[PDB]
Amino acid sequence: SRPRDCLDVLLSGQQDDGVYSVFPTHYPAGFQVYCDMRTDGGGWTVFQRREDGSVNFFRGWDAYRDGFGRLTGEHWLGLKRIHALTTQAAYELHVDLEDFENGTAYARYGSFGVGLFSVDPEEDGYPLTVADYSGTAGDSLLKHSGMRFTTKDRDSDHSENNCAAFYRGAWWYRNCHTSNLNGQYLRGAHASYADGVEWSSWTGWQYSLKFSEMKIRPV
Amino acid sequence: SRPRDCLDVLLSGQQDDGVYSVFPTHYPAGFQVYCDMRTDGGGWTVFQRREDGSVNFFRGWDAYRDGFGRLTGEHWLGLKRIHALTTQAAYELHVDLEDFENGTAYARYGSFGVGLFSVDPEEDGYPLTVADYSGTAGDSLLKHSGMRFTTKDRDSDHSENNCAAFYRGAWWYRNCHTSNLNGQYLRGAHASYADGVEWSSWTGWQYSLKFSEMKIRPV
Amino acid sequence: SRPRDCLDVLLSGQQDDGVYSVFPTHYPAGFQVYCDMRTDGGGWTVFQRREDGSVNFFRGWDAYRDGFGRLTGEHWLGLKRIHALTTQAAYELHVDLEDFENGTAYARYGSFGVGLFSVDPEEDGYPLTVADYSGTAGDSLLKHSGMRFTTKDRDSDHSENNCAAFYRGAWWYRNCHTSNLNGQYLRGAHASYADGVEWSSWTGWQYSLKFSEMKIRPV
Amino acid sequence: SRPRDCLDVLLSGQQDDGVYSVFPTHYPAGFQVYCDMRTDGGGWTVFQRREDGSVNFFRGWDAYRDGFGRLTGEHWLGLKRIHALTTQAAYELHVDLEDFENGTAYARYGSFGVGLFSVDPEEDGYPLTVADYSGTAGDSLLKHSGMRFTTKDRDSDHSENNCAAFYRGAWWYRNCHTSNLNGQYLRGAHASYADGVEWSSWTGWQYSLKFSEMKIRPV
Ligand SMILES: *[C@@H]1O[C@H](CO[C@@H]2O[C@@H](C)[C@@H](O)[C@@H](O)[C@@H]2O)[C@@H](O[C@@H]2O[C@H](CO)[C@@H](O)[C@H](O)[C@H]2NC(C)=O)[C@H](O[C@@H]2O[C@@H](C)[C@@H](O)[C@@H](O)[C@@H]2O)[C@H]1NC(C)=O
Ligand SMILES: *[C@@H]1O[C@H](CO[C@@H]2O[C@@H](C)[C@@H](O)[C@@H](O)[C@@H]2O)[C@@H](O[C@@H]2O[C@H](CO)[C@@H](O)[C@H](O)[C@H]2NC(C)=O)[C@H](O[C@@H]2O[C@@H](C)[C@@H](O)[C@@H](O)[C@@H]2O)[C@H]1NC(C)=O
Ligand SMILES: *[C@@H]1O[C@H](CO[C@@H]2O[C@@H](C)[C@@H](O)[C@@H](O)[C@@H]2O)[C@@H](O[C@@H]2O[C@H](CO)[C@@H](O)[C@H](O)[C@H]2NC(C)=O)[C@H](O[C@@H]2O[C@@H](C)[C@@H](O)[C@@H](O)[C@@H]2O)[C@H]1NC(C)=O
Ligand SMILES: *[C@@H]1O[C@H](CO[C@@H]2O[C@@H](C)[C@@H](O)[C@@H](O)[C@@H]2O)[C@@H](O[C@@H]2O[C@H](CO)[C@@H](O)[C@H](O)[C@H]2NC(C)=O)[C@H](O[C@@H]2O[C@@H](C)[C@@H](O)[C@@H](O)[C@@H]2O)[C@H]1NC(C)=O
Ligand SMILES: CC(=O)N[C@@H]1[C@@H](O)[C@H](O)[C@@H](CO)O[C@H]1O
Ligand SMILES: CC(=O)N[C@@H]1[C@@H](O)[C@H](O)[C@@H](CO)O[C@H]1O
Ligand SMILES: CC(=O)N[C@@H]1[C@@H](O)[C@H](O)[C@@H](CO)O[C@H]1O
Ligand SMILES: CC(=O)N[C@@H]1[C@@H](O)[C@H](O)[C@@H](CO)O[C@H]1O
Ligand SMILES: [Ca+2]
Ligand SMILES: [Ca+2]
Ligand SMILES: [Ca+2]
Ligand SMILES: [Ca+2]
């Protein structure tokens, strides 16, 4: 009837990958999401995908809050939706990654949320909660724990510069990053420093990944 | 109780043409619509009517998003409402047309939607999905499939010009149109090129129709 | 549980005059209103009161849309709330009036609504539907039927002037009025022409009433 | 299922202090609050906490309306949420206070609300209802009864000055205050007059408290 996330959709008997309506506790109008019903038994709610560089990710605060792109392709679900999902239960984060040779790796975090205790999560800058790494890609996110979300037009980072302008993305930047999955789609090895779709622990600072998917499931 | 569209209203036992409350999945406050309970067994939700040129259709982005006119007369329901309806199920589109001699034709499309997989359908420009033509008016819409919605103040078309300014309407313009049902109410044959209530496949580029109704029903 | 108006509140077993929560069809968050449980058997939803000139009624479009004052005193409920109430069923309007000698009269209208078929009732200017007068005050509203709502900062009247600026109120002005219950609280007989709390059919153009209440009940 | 406040959460069988979802009558999307399940049997909804001066409370109208800080630390829940809570039932207010020596006192008010009968509580300035004092801190709030909320950028006080600018806080200021719990975190005794976290009846005009919590429970 009113699944709160893709795990409710899966447990209701929908086994196919695709677009479904979900209805978080504090977002009762609901919205549509892409559900991954295959990974480790399925029930993952996607909030980010890169796969071909068809969508501009170098967007400002309003676009990162509200979301952009298409559920069937490259997209960012919107921090207001990711907040609505991650505050309603205890969620884990799965990150799938692919290089241009179709090599793959993943990073799993047993704890993930954005603006979890923020009265105004937008004003508070949708700060990241992340813990408990396992996987094959290595950890490129724990160093971002506690950081606010920074865009080219809204600086809340630990740099004297704007990390988002500098590394051409949008992220929970410190000074500045170990990961940059909202970076420019630079298509593999690049001379420029750390300004592509980067996961430093797997492919370092000068390799823009082919594919990323960031997705959540209740623990 | 809470019909999601005019077909739910009809199947609940309301057989009369008129104004009813509907409550789409992701628009739970609901809104009122004109229901056509006669055409091909009935249950059509109207989202556009022209009949007398009493309402200005040469409106900007905000008016096309939010809707204008009156449900009992000339109106545009609003792309935010048409998105809310067409994302909740698989809908067909019916287009009724009339000339100034009370001649009539129709176009049916077995698939229709706006911003179907858009995370932010407004920013994405409420792009048209349309397929599977049958009817008597000929096809004047399939060539618009995949196009974003363009207004005089928001250009997302495939022209070096603004198609909306140029053809004095608001539509899923390419370069520029085969149909222009939101065009100026020019009252039949006109010298100006393709800037009236046009359905090119039926009455060509220099004839502004008397009546149009665009309406949807689940398949 | 969820009364849609003061008549639902009365029929649920609440007999006392006062402030209650109501939940109109298309305003499901609900809001509070003053219920008149005495007049002609009770169940009237108040949307306007004048009684002492403590509240400024010479307000702009946003205040008339959103409402102002206090439910227990002088107030205007807001055209967005009056629209939400009058579109959910067929309502009658009761107008109670008092002069400074505690003389009283009433006007009843068997049909009343604002923006009844408007797709965007705000843009359409919350046009008045009113019919079927009876009472003791005489008819000072039927001549306003079909008129849009005009404020000092939003002119939709049939005057070359702004009727709202000119008669220091906010109303469904034609050219200009027979009634002006949102006029200045001028306290009885005044030299200035028709710019007080006027009901012309009862006390003419140069008498600002002590008390007005405008209230609705389903028929 | 849908507790309206922390007392519903407690009576549903949740005995632990912490963050819970509540769903007020006229705010059905709901929001999260910190519940005090210990004080005088428990079931208190927190709307204000000071404890360490980590959060700036010298904020404007929008921040006081919308809320700021974190539920687990220093925060202000937002006047739009406090209105939604205090209009749904008859609430009492509990104020806990601590000095820098870990000395403690409390003030209890048997009646508390903000914008209780306001049609537009924001425009009306979220005016305070408070009555019926008991406790150990003395009364520093009854003199504020009937006052609108004043911020540095929105003056509704009884001073020729802006009390909020002058006493570096945000409060239901008269001319100007006996309490200032949204004042600067000045850390105990200060030379400056009445511009810290003040409760004048307990620690006078020149002592900024260590800890304050303002919280409500239905009577
Ligand atoms: C890399 O993988 C791409 C995705 O292919 C799918 O996933 C693979 C892991 C595997 O399961 C495969 O069977 C799947 O089809 C490939 O693109 C796909 O290629 C197939 C033809 O084999 C084509 O029909 C699909 O449409 C296409 N998918 C997409 C999203 O483009 C890549 O294949 C290369 O590029 C293709 C466009 C095609 O030209 C093919 O001949 C190429 O090998 C895989 N390789 C690389 C280096 O990108
Ligand atoms: C064209 O059709 C208009 C709509 O008429 C209705 O639909 C028709 C298909 C048919 O079913 C008819 O019986 C319906 O009444 C006509 O306008 C209507 O005319 C009738 C009188 O016959 C009148 O009472 C209606 O109010 C009127 N409706 C509207 C919406 O105006 C046209 O009739 C012409 O114009 C009329 C205003 C009237 O003056 C009549 O004598 C005219 O023939 C039809 N013809 C044309 C060329 O427009
Ligand atoms: C006009 O009526 C006012 C309202 O009084 C109530 O309604 C009447 C129709 C009647 O049912 C009466 O019993 C009600 O009390 C009067 O004001 C009220 O006066 C009473 C004292 O009789 C007082 O206790 C109320 O608080 C007061 N109400 C309000 C809203 O002010 C008027 O009375 C005059 O003004 C009063 C303030 C008081 O001073 C009294 O002596 C005056 O006669 C009525 N007369 C006029 C000319 O205004
Ligand atoms: C004042 O009280 C602070 C809060 O302590 C808790 O509440 C007390 C009423 C009591 O129930 C106590 O058992 C609780 O722990 C103290 O801070 C706490 O101190 C403890 C060590 O005793 C420490 O483990 C806690 O993390 C700490 N809490 C917080 C919120 O900081 C104050 O203790 C002083 O400051 C501490 C940081 C620590 O250094 C301690 O040695 C100090 O005595 C209490 N005293 C004062 C003057 O502030
Ligand atoms: C992309 C980025 O922030 N890179 C590095 C950071 O990882 C490194 O630890 C630091 C050394 O001081 O220099 C930063 O520029
Ligand atoms: C209204 C409109 O866009 N008309 C035509 C289009 O249908 C035609 O195919 C093209 C030829 O290049 O010229 C455009 O102006
Ligand atoms: C307040 C107002 O509009 N008054 C009158 C109107 O009632 C009258 O019929 C008309 C005569 O032309 O003159 C208007 O000014
Ligand atoms: C902080 C504040 O408003 N303090 C005092 C007030 O309590 C006092 O009664 C008044 C004397 O006139 O002077 C004000 O400044
Ligand atoms: Ca910076
Ligand atoms: Ca163009
Ligand atoms: Ca005018
Ligand atoms: Ca002042």
Q: Classify residue C71 by burial, with Cβ atoms within 10 Å: 0-12, 13-18, 19+.
A: buried
- Ligand closest in space to the Cα of B175: 6
Interchain pair A30, B27: CB under 8 A: no
Secondary structure (3-state) at A31: strand
Q: What type of residue is C111?
A: S
CA dist B15 and B18 (Å) reads 9
Question: Cis peptide before C176, with omega less than 30 degrees from 0?
Answer: yes
Do residues C150 and C64 touch, judged by C-beta distance below 8 A?
no
- Tokens 């998105």 belong to B83
- DSSP class of D149: P
The amino acid that residue B132 corresponds to is D
Q: Are A10 and A217 in contact (CB under 8 A)?
A: no
Q: Which residues pair with A143 in a beta bridge?
A: none
From residue A166, give the alpha-carbon distance in Å to each of A142, A158, A187, A195, B22: 21, 13, 19, 8, 48
Spatial CB neighbours of C62, under 8 Å, sequence gap ≥ 6 = none
- Tell me which chain A residues have a C-beta less than 8 angstroms from the C-beta of D32: 26, 87, 117
With a 6 A CB cut-off, is B168 part of the ligand 6 pocket?
no
Q: What is the resolution of this structure in A?
A: 1.9
DSSP summary character for residue A149:
P
- What ligand 5 atom has the least distance to the C-alpha of A193? 1
Cα separations in angstroms, D155 against D102, D149, D164: 35, 8, 8
Residue whose token pair is 């906010």: C170
Q: How far, CA to CA in Å, does A202 sit from each of A138, A139, A140, C152?
A: 6, 8, 8, 65
Q: What is the 3-state secondary structure (H, E, C) of chain B?
A: CCCCCHHHHHHCCCCCCEEEEECCCCCCCCEEEEEECCHHHCCEEEEEEECCCCCCCCCCHHHHHHCEEECCCCEECCHHHHHHHHCCCCEEEEEEEECCCCCEEEEEEEEEEECCCECCCCCCCCCEEEEEEEECCCCCCHHHCCCCCEECCECCCCCCCCHHHHCCCCECCCCCCCEECCCECCCEECCCCCCECEEHHHHCCCEECCEEEEEEEEC
Question: What is the Cα–Cα distance from A123 to A142, expressed in whole angstroms?
Answer: 23
Spell out the SS3 assignment of C90-117.
Answer: CEEEEEEEECCCCCEEEEEEEEEEECCC
Token digits of residue B13: 């036992």
B76 and C119 in contact by Cβ < 8 A? yes
Q: Do residues D6 and D37 make contact, with C-beta atoms less than 8 angstroms apart?
A: yes
Tokens 């709502």, located at residue: C149
Structure tokens at A75: 């997209």
Residue C61 phi/psi, 5-degree rounding, is: -55, -50
Contacts of A3 (CB under 8 A, 6+ apart): A9, A12, A20, A21, A22, A23
**What's phi and psi for B43, nearest 5 deg?**
90, 25
Cα D207 to Cα D198: distance, rounded to the nearest angstrom? 6
Alpha helices in chain C (DSSP H): 6-11, 61-66, 79-86, 163-166, 200-203
What is the distance between the alpha carbons of residues D173 and D156, in angstroms, rounded to a whole number?
8
Backbone phi and psi for residue A14, each to the nearest 5 degrees, phi listed first: -85, 105
DSSP D143: G
**Ligand 4 midpoint to CA B136 (Å):** 83
Provide the pairing of β-strand B68-69 with B75-76: antiparallel
CB-based contact C119 B63, cutoff 8 Å: no
| SS3 call for C47 | strand
Q: How far apart are the first and last CA of chain C?
A: 22
Give the distance (Å) from ligand 7 centre to CA of residue C177: 7
B147 Cβ below 6 A of ligand 6: no
C-beta of residue D125 within 8 angstroms of C-beta of residue D146: no
Cα dist from D62 to A40, B31, D59, D180, whole Å: 44, 30, 8, 19
Contacts of B56 (CB under 8 A, 6+ apart): none
User: Hey, is the C-beta of D73 within 8 angstroms of any chain A C-beta?
Assistant: yes
Rounded Cα distance, C188 and C111, in Å: 30
Tally of CB atoms within 10 A around B73: 14
A84 contacts A27 by C-beta, under 8 angstroms = yes
The whole-angstrom separation of Cα D201 and Cα D144 is 14
How buried is A89 (Cβ within 10 angstroms: 0-12 exposed, 13-18 middle, 19+ buried)?
Answer: middle
- Beta strand C75-76 pairing with C207-208: unpaired
Query: What single letter denotes the amino acid at residue A164?
Result: A
Under a CB-based contact definition with an 8 Å cutoff, are residues C76 and C68 in contact?
yes
**Which helix (DSSP H) or strand (DSSP E) does residue A92 occupy?**
strand A91-98
A199 φ/ψ angles, rounded to the nearest 5 degrees: -130, 90
Q: Is B155 within any annotated ligand binding site?
A: yes
- Look at strands B179-180 and B198-199 and give their pairing: antiparallel
Contact predicate A29/B24, CB 8 Å: no
- A177 in contact with ligand 5, CB cutoff 6 A: yes
User: What is the distance in A from the centroid of ligand 4 to the CA of D102?
Assistant: 9
What amino acid is encoded at D126 in this protein?
A: Y
Cα dist from A199 to A138, B171, C185, D179, whole Å:
9, 42, 69, 52
Beta strand D104-114 pairing with B104-114: unpaired
Distance C175 CA to ligand 7 centre (A): 6
A191 touches chain D (CB under 8 A): no
* CA–CA gap between residue C57 and residue C63 (Å, rounded): 9
- Helix, strand or coil, per DSSP, at residue A11: helix
Element (H, E) at A163: helix A163-166
Ligand 6 and B108: CB distance under 6 A: no
Chain-centre distance of CA B51, in angstroms? 14
Q: Give the separation between CA C10 and CA C17, rounded to whole angstroms.
A: 10
Chain B residues within an 8 Å CB radius of A71 = 117-119
Judge: A71–B124 Cβ closer than 8 Å, yes or no.
Answer: no
Type of residue numbered B150 = T
Block residue for tokens 């396992």: A134
Q: Is B106 exposed, middle or buried (0-12, 13-18, 19+ CB in 10 A)?
A: middle
Can you tell me whether residue A197 is helix, strand or coil?
coil
Residues facing residue D75 across a β-bridge: D49, D69
D70 and A CB contact within 8 Å? yes
- Alpha carbon distance C88, D184 (integer Å): 50
Rounded Cα–Cα distance for residues D76 and D65 (Å) = 9
Q: Which long-range contacts (CB under 8 A, 24 or more apart) does A190-199 make?
A: A194/A167, A195/A166, A195/A167, A195/A168, A195/A169, A197/A50, A198/A140, A198/A167, A199/A95, A199/A97, A199/A105, A199/A107, A199/A137, A199/A138, A199/A140
Question: Quick count: other Cβ atoms within 10 Å of Cβ C129?
Answer: 17
Please confirm whether the linkage preceding D6 is cis (ω < 30° from 0): no
C-alpha of residue C176 to centroid of ligand 7, in Å: 6
Q: Is the CB of C144 under 6 A from ligand 7?
A: no
Buried (b) or exposed (e) across B156-166, using 16+ Cβ within 10 A? bbebeebbbeb
Report the C-alpha gap between D166 and D161 in whole angstroms: 7
Q: In A, which residues are within 8 Å of B119 by CB distance?
A: 67-71, 75-78
Distance D203 CA to ligand 12 centre (A): 26
Q: What is the DSSP letter of A24?
A: -
Q: Which residue has the tokens 């003389």?
A: C103
Amino acid at C69: G
Query: Which ligand is located closest to the Cα atom of residue C147?
Result: 11
Minimal Cα distance from A18: which residue of B? Answer: B117
CA end-to-end span of chain B? 22
CB contact under 8 A, D71 and A117: yes
Polymer length in residues for chain C: 219
Residue appearing with tokens 């049997």? D41
Experimental method: X-ray
Type of residue found at B100: F
Q: Nearest-CA residue of chain D relative to C73?
A: D117
Residue D191, number of CB atoms within 10 A of its CB: 6
Test C120 with B78 for CB contact under 8 angstroms. yes
D101 Cβ contact partners less than 8 Å away, ≥ 6 residues apart: none
Of residues D193, D167, D196, the one with CA closest to residue D184: D196
Peptide bond into A163 cis (omega under 30): no
> Which residue in this structure is represented by tokens 């409550």?
B23
Biggest CA–CA distance in chain B, Å, is: 51
CA distances from D56 to B68, D49, D70, D74, D208 (A): 44, 12, 12, 9, 15
DSSP H helices in A67-145: 79-86
Amino acid symbol at A201:
S
Closest alpha carbon to C71 in C91, C88, C51: C51
Chain A CB contacts of D66 under 8 Å are 120, 123
Instruction: Note whether D117 contacts C72, CB cutoff 8 Å.
Output: yes
Around ion ligand 10, residues with a beta carbon closer than 5 Å are B 155, 157, 159
- Measured distance CA(A161)–CA(C119) in Å, rounded: 48
Q: Identify the nearest ligand to the CA of D177 by its number.
A: 8
DSSP string, D56-104: -----HHHHHH-EEBTTSSEE--HHHHHHHHTSS-EEEEEEEE-TTS-E
CA of C34 to the centre of ligand 3 (A): 21
| Block residue for tokens 């176009």 | B107
Q: B61, B151 in Cβ contact below 8 A? A: yes
Nearest Cα neighbor of A130 from A149, A110, A115, A150 is: A110
Q: Which residue has the tokens 């030299």?
A: C191
Nearest CA in chain A to B28: A29
Residue in chain D lying closest to A116 (CA)? D70
Phi-psi region of A67 (alpha: psi -120 to 50; beta: other; left: phi over 0): left
- Residue C199: its H or E element: strand C198-199
B28 and A29: CB-CB below 8 Å?
Answer: yes
Instruction: Please give the distance of CA A154 from its chain centroid, rounded to a whole number.
Output: 18
d(CA D153, CA B102): 62
Nearest to D28 among A28, A119, A124 (CB): A28
- SS3 for C57-78, per residue? CCCCHHHHHHCEEECCCCEECC
Cβ neighbours of A142 (radius 10 Å): 16
Kindly report whether the peptide bond that precedes residue B35 is cis, defined as omega within 30 degrees of 0. no
> Residue D18 burial by CB count (10 A; 0-12/13-18/19+): exposed, middle or buried?
middle
**C and D: number of Cβ contacts within 8 A:** 40
**Rounded to an integer, what distance in angstroms lies between the CA atom of residue B141 and that of residue B12?**
32
d(CA D172, CA B65): 40
Q: C159, exposed or middle or buried, with CB in 10 Å at 0-12, 13-18, 19+?
A: middle
**How many C-beta neighbours within 10 Å does residue C43 have?**
23
Facing residue for C69 by CB, picked from D26, D27, D119: D119
What is the spatial distance between Cα C87 and Cα C117, in angstroms, rounded to a whole number?
8
Residue C40: how many CB atoms within 10 A of its CB? 12
Most A-contacting residue of B119, B120, B122 (CB-CB within 10 A), to test interface: B119
By most ligand atoms within 8 Å of CB, the mutation choice from B176, B190, B203, B206 for ligand 6 is B176
Q: Tell me, what amino acid is at A89?
A: A
HSE (CB half, 13 Å, CA atoms) of C158? 12
Question: Does the beta-carbon distance from A69 to B119 stay under 8 Å?
Answer: yes
Which residues make Cβ contacts (< 8 Å) with residue B124, sequence separation at least 6? A68, A69, A70, B115, B118, B148
Q: Which residues is D110 bridged to in the sheet? A: none
Cβ–Cβ under 8 Å, residues A5 and A11: no
Residue D50's nearest CA partner among D176, D204, D170, D219 is D170
Other CB atoms within a 10 A radius of the CB of residue C23 amount to: 20
Closest to D84 (Cα-Cα) out of D28, D32, D8: D28
| Token pair recorded at residue A107 | 């990073």
> CA of D121: which chain C residue's CA is closest?
C68
For residue A191, the CA-to-ligand 5 centroid distance in Å is 16
Instruction: Confirm if D146 and D127 have CB atoms less than 8 A apart.
Output: yes
User: Is residue C199 within 8 Å of residue C137, measured between CB atoms?
Assistant: yes
Within 10 angstroms of residue C9's Cβ, the number of other Cβ atoms is: 23
Query: Which burial class, exposed, middle or buried, applies to C101 when counting CB atoms under 10 A from its CB (0-12, 13-18, 19+)?
Result: exposed
Q: Which of residues 9-28 of C touch B (CB under 8 A)?
A: 25-28
Distances (CA, A) of A160 to A172, A182, A192, D77: 15, 21, 20, 32
| Amino acid type, C6 | C
Structure tokens at A128: 């990241």
Q: Give yes or no for a contact between A181 and A197, defined as CB atoms under 8 angstroms apart.
A: yes
Chains adjacent to B (≥3 CB pairs closer than 8 angstroms): A, C
Residue with tokens 């009493």: B54
Give the C-alpha distances (Å, rounded to integers) separating A154 from A148, A164, A170, A218, C65. 10, 9, 10, 30, 33
Chain D residues 32-51 within an 8 A CB cutoff of chain A:
32
Tokens of B177: 């149109």
Asked whether residue C124 is marked as a ligand-binding residue, the answer is no
- Pair of tokens at residue A17: 């990958």
Token digits of residue B29: 């406050």
Distance (Å) from the C-alpha of residue D207 to the closest C-alpha of chain C? 37
Cis peptide before A6 (omega within 30 of 0): no
Beta-carbon count within 10 A of D19 CB: 15
Contact present, A208 and A185 (Cβ < 8 Å): yes
| A87 shares contact with chain D (CB less than 8 Å) | yes
